[PDB]
């Protein structure tokens, strides 16, 4: 019970407030949260477009 109320009062409420503030106020402005542009590897497909990245040049593989 003590840990349950501690998690609600000290984790759940702060994360609620911070998530609300980030999702509805900080990201209302441009460039406030900037991501990394995740890596693209050959053979991947993109969720947005659906196209497939071409593979490598089939290099000679041994050992």
């Amino acid at each position: 019970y003590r840990h349950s109320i501690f998690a609600v009062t000290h984790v759940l409420i702060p994360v609620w407030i911070i998530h609300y503030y980030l999702k509805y106020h900080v990201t209302a402005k441009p460039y406030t949260v900037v991501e990394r542009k995740p890596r693209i590897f050959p053979g991947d497909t993109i969720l947005e477009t659906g196209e497939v990245i071409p593979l490598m040049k089939e290099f000679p593989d041994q050992h």
Partner: protein, 124 residues
């Protein structure tokens, strides 16, 4: 190390300066002069955004290593073969650099021998 001892305690001109290497034309030795092969293109190697100092002739093996590390995440011992492949390709790269150092050193040796032979012929 022995080469440092040779260069700093022996004749400096005997062995190369690593900053100025190479000092001879590439095809000076043999005329076949094959060029190195690059597997990863510009765009895919930029999209992987590896690093500027990781963007060498070993890039494609690094692409595959990163591809495994991303795909099999919780099993961080899953892809060990591609780690070995990238290490082997880098080992071959370092061996090639060592061969370049040795070749330049031997060319310097032979050039000094030709110079002293010409000096002996002139004095004769």
């Amino acid at each position: 190390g022995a080469h440092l001892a040779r260069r700093y305690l022996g004749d400096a001109s005997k062995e190369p300066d690593p900053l100025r290497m190479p000092t001879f034309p590439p095809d000076y030795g043999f005329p076949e002069r094959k060029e190195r092969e690059m597997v990863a293109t510009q765009q895919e190697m930029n999209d992987a955004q590896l690093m500027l100092q990781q963007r060498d002739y070993c890039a494609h093996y690094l692409i595959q290593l990163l591809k495994c590390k991303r795909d099999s995440f919780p099993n961080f011992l899953a892809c060990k073969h591609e780690q070995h492949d990238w290490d082997y390709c880098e080992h071959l790269d370092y061996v090639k650099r060592m061969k370049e150092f040795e070749r330049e050193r031997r060319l310097l040796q032979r050039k000094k021998r030709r110079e002293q032979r010409e000096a002996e012929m002139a004095r004769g």
